[PDB]
Amino acid sequence: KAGGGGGGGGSGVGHSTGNYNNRTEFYYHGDEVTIVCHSSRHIHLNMSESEEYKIYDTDRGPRFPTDQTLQGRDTINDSYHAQVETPWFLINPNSWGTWMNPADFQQLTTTCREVTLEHLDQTLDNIVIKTVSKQGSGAEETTQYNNDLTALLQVALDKSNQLPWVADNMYLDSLGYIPWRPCKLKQYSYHVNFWNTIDIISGPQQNQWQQVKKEIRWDDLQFTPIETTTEIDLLRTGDSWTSGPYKFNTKPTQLSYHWQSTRHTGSVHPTDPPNAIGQQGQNIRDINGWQWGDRSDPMSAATRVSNFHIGYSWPEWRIHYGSGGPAINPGAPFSQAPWSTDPQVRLTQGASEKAIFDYNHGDDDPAHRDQWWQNNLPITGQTNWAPKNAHQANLSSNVPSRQEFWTQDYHNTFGPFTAVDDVGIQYPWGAIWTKTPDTTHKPMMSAHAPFICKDGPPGQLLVKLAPNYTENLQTDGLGNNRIVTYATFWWTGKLILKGKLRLPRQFNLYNLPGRPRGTEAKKFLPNEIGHFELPFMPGRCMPNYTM
Amino acid sequence: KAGGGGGGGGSGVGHSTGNYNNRTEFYYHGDEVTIVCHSSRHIHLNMSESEEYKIYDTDRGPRFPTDQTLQGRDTINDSYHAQVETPWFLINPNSWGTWMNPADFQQLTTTCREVTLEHLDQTLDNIVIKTVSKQGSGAEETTQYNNDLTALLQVALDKSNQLPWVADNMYLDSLGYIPWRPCKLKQYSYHVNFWNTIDIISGPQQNQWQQVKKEIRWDDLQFTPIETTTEIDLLRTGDSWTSGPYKFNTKPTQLSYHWQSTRHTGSVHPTDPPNAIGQQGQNIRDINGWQWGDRSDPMSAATRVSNFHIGYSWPEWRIHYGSGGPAINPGAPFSQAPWSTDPQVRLTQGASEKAIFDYNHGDDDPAHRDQWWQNNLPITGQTNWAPKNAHQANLSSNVPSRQEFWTQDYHNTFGPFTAVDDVGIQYPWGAIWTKTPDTTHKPMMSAHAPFICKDGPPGQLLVKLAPNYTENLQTDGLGNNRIVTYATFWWTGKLILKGKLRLPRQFNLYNLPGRPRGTEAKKFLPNEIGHFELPFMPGRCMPNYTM
Amino acid sequence: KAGGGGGGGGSGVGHSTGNYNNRTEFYYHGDEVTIVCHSSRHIHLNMSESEEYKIYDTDRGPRFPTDQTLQGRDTINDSYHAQVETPWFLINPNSWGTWMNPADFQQLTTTCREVTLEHLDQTLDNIVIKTVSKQGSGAEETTQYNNDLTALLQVALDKSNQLPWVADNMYLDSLGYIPWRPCKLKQYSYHVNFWNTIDIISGPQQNQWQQVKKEIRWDDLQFTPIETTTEIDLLRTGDSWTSGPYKFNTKPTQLSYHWQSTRHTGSVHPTDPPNAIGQQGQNIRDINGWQWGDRSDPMSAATRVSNFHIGYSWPEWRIHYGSGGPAINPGAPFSQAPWSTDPQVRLTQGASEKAIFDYNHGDDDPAHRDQWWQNNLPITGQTNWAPKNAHQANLSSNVPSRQEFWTQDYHNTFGPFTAVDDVGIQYPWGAIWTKTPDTTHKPMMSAHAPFICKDGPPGQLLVKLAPNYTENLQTDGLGNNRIVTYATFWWTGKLILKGKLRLPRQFNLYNLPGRPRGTEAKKFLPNEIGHFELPFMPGRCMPNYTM
């Protein structure tokens, strides 16, 4: 939209075109809260490695099998793909923690039972473009950094969402979480049409993996540049840019976790109360009610009829093996905590996720990457491990035979009576919103991002540094035609949220097994070098009743 | 809301605070009907066994295995749970037959093709509280029943639905179906957080069952009393109470059953008509149309393409084994009548249900409980027995090989093209409405209750009898501190329905295999002692076309 | 004021004169919150043991010395006093936890940085008076409990505060903390003028204790009854009573604890930063600034001048030994945590306090009393142990001699430059408000109760049960003249608070060493008998900056 920026007017060289606001404000009126998140980053930008659009495919990636030693079980290591590489760089606000710090997100999840996205707004200002000049040889080598005052920054935004939306925050290409650190960008690219099909049932014994088709699909290939698609704003030093307001159309995410399964949910089995300490209740044998099958005499609560069912079984860790190669079809998130005996054995089957991140995304070390693995421990109550289930021919007063009873079947149990939950907010490293795929059936829930954009997602902000060519422009030349140039500028954004107030639903005091536990707090705080970690908090934090 | 009651004003001792209306009215205007159901019960109430809230767990219940004799197949007998027991008693209107009698529900299903819930309203009036006084020893023992005129009845309603909704009518804790009989209440309780996880694939051969975690989860436990949650109305004899109007937001239930499968549904296979008696039509061999696979020559109606598919396969009688223990994941209701050969063999696999009930719920005997088992016989046309299905590699003009054809696979076949039905109304013993679980994905249908409340369910009416303490109040005392007290009062309620008129869609006369068959009618009518049975009628009664 | 009550009108026998509201509401608008606490109790009342006002003195109490074995150090065990005993009973709302439950007080201290008292209001309704009648002898003994409908309850309130205010909640005579349990009252009494003076420096070696004067002072004695002082309302069953609104004039209590001493407070000593991990900063030797004495060269931060001083020294555990006997002169509250090495050694010297309480005040056991001992661990930063301090003759560049340096002096260090804090809210067992003593110098702070009433305290609600005399009234008779009678009625009160919103002042996440720690949570929740504990929370909970 071009625009203004920050608080400054900024006309020409020597005037600032905007200010710095990283503050977050909470506004409580009645049942509702308004969270206004301001986020401001200082962005470093280099030249595009190439001024050309490039279409190429890749290798398989590390650990992919070169033989049948593991019989194709490690073909899940396939990173093969094909892409266009666009000279443009992407500014991605979409993560939690680009916006709120650990104390703000704690404020959010304690005071709000749910939250929704309202508005987004963005500016770019205080553009500084410099060229580097090297004068010397070995020792006399001296780099001079000169302001190029007439050099241009190129800015493109998609309000129309005509470019392939890829800014999902997977791979964590997003603005850093630490307000006082600089952000380098990464260069925009998207997938083209390719076939990658791996046959893992190949061979005589059907134990061998084989490549079927791996190629780029050139006759169907869609190449859309930035230049022929969106308006590109050209900006000098005294110039600033605003996106204009964006309005989210989304659905609220609930900030509590549900502990109830169908055995926790409805009317309780008639019970004789204990009259003494250490005594237990006794289930009444003769009762009336609804059982499932022809079953009558064992009035046990397991076979009580229910209206709905909480959770569903899945072929957990499903590998798809489609066109484009194997992917994972997630399954429902839940907690393996009810089944966990050995702390050394790590049960991943609750559709758990793993965050790999770095210094600017909340790792306390450079040169290395910290990990997390959120296994969703509070989300018990959907927990369904497919091998733990069973089915039997009939439900009656009679126990089935060995041949009428089946176990370890790995069936999809999602159906019309099932009630499930999504993951919710993973605070530091999780994405905020997502684009909806344009298909006849649009997905019901999201496996990661808590907010699904009903119309468009917020437009992708693409910046490029216009090339500074030398006196001699040769068609054969690439980066020898162009002067070495880099920019620094300032991104500011404002994201507004609307929460619903959380008030106590219980008599007893709310407990917490999360981060506020101390003695671990030497990290999460800067050290003598200024290095620190950002803690994980779930969006689903306090317990709540399902029904 | 406190309130009035019945038709009487009732100021003080000696004035009646309400009247008795158990009449049901039908109002026919045009295409629509209005059913106004009045229901009035005389309610007996005793002291709370304890004035304390209690949290405890239970035993497993009867028939649960103590060993591996049945290898864990009888772990489906688990009733283990954990609950709070609240001193309050629950008044539950939610059942059919608390409202309509057998002649009213016959009037409903014959004249209406569908019905929806409109309003609910409730009153409590004519409060009588008495204390018992025993004077004598063995023979001289004499019980005197004295009016305590200043004693209080406590009434709490949830309009906000802040208490755990458990009044689903499972276990048939509901107001009785016979207008002239008294109703004892049962004491309100709900589930707390507990883990019950049974590993049935345990052991070396994976044939043994093992307890993994069985406990109460105290750190997540939510304890919500009635006193800190809702307003409690205190009522003496000359006092009455009204709930205020409740408005249902629901979806109509269809009062007909569907006999069409996908073989009954669309265009008919081109056929040569018979010209004589005892002759049959002949399917035309050379026809044009859409088949499924590469199939061409066998133009058979089985492989005709369709737009949708009626019914879905399920791992029938799925045992979940989640946190909280095993439960059943229902599957779609349908009729095993097309597959039933032996009347002695009872095929339960259509998601059939079993009602166990007693004297006030429509059993003609006290001291024993009658049973029903509704196997949904008219609901043929969804009938899908998973072992009866198959799948094959290709569909072509060629019959597949033995290795290309699979049977007895127990797969969930629910998908985007499927059309299914819920059970509908089971008249005497079935619930009317249900609460929706609060989850990211809310269930599409209900496995039992025909009406799903979109906003809240009707609030739970909880009554308690305020304790009458003796002169000496000791903290160590429980029921020795309190005078033996009981109450009788009168519940009145009005439930309004809106039906759509059913008019004849066919030339031939509608037949009926249901209850109007006589010679069984000596029951269903009182006998010389006044004992009688209430008949079962389905909400889905007359046949109708699906498409 | 006489009045109405609850929600009911209640005219005559058979109408309820009020309802039950124990709910607490939070109202968030902008920077401010409004907490409306409703509290409703069911109160048991017996006859006054005597219808007479009695003036008497007592014994010394247990553990008081009968000899010089401990040389008078155990004369701190003196409970001797003199009182009038008034036939009236006291209803005391003044405690936290009569009002809020553990989840409400957690809501308060997390969302509010400070809170103040606004209004108080009280009602009494649903009066039930009964007489007991015993008929039989040994086995035939039978107690009949009859409603006496014309019997009276007597109610007196002081809006004028003309009676000796003694309802300070010390001794924990206050309405119970559990909404669903009954409350017995205790009979009102206050001190008269007496001399108790114990000389502990008596004897030749000044090691012996001696009684100087122990007596009642009859010539100065002030006897004020309830009857000649306040209006007494007489109430039957169909009657109710309201106090009218009371408005608090008080000062807000701050809900955070301060960790800063004078070494934590102002400008920081000039320091050379560490450039590596594991390295420490280095204090700069040559700096400029203000030191205290003639001191110049050691520019150390200990001798930096400050404007104020946080905390003061005290002759900790001062025993007063005045008229009326020994008492303790408290000293400032603070935390011994910085000095605590042995967990087995309990350092009491921070003006710590000890709560002894029972079943209705948050003990999980009857027949025994639980304890707490709040030692104020977060309140480090005032911590001043008098023997740990010192003083020296001069402050210079020279270290003083052995004779110029003093230790262990036990001096009061309170003065014009000192800044201190009070304790704040001890949630379950602490008092809310207090009366100010009427003296030329009124106290600055309070050693226990967080709120000091500037004008009057809320009036004392005194109830008595009017005596039911038998046919024969003899002047010699006491309790043989009167029929055995008891009452039960319902107290309702509404207390309103105005908090100031707490918003995050820090980047890092707030940690907590308090109660939300689980694994201790099996208590604090009811058990199979319904017994549970109430947790302690401080009013000063989160950290905050002093300056």
Residue numbers in the entry:
A (entry chain E), B (entry chain Q), C (entry chain P): 23 to 569
Mind quoting what the paper says about this structure?
BuV1 is a member of the Protoparvovirus genus of the Parvoviridae family. Similar to all known parvoviruses, BuV1 assembles into a T = 1 icosahedral capsid. The gross capsid morphology includes pores at the 5-fold vertices, protrusions surrounding the 3-fold axes, a depression region at the 2-fold axes, and a wall separating the depressed regions near the 2- and 5-fold axes. The VPs have an eight-stranded β-barrel motif and an α-helix that form the core of the capsid, which is characteristic of all members of the Parvoviridae.
In order to characterize the structural rearrangements that may occur under various pHs relevant to the viral lifecycle, BuV1 capsids were dialyzed to pH 7.4, 4.0, or 2.6, vitrified on cryo-EM grids, and subjected to cryo-EM data collection. Subsequent 3D reconstruction yielded electron density maps at 2.84, 3.20, and 2.73 Å for pH 7.4, 4.0, and 2.6, respectively. At pH 2.6, the ordering of the N-terminus allowed for the assignment of 10 additional residues compared to either pH 7.4 or 4.0 structures. However, reasonable electron density allowed the fitting of this loop at pH 2.6. For instance, the large rearrangement in VR-IX observed at pH 2.6 occurs at the 2-fold axis of symmetry, which suggests that this may destabilize the 2-fold interface. Indeed, in micrographs of the BuV1 capsid at pH 2.6, capsids were observed that appeared “broken” (red arrow). The ordering of additional residues at the N-terminal was also observed at pH 2.6, similar to the HBoV1 and HBoV2 capsids. At pH 7.4 and 2.6, the rotamer is in an extended conformation, resulting in a pore with an approximate radius of 3.8 Å. At pH 2.6, when the virus is presumably in the stomach, Q157 adopts an extended conformation that restricts the radius of the 5-fold pore, preventing premature externalization of VP1u or the viral genome. The cryo-EM micrographs clearly show both full and half (broken) capsids at this pH; therefore, it is unclear whether the lack of signal is due to the fluorescent dye or if some of the hydrophobic patches of the capsid are exposed before heating.
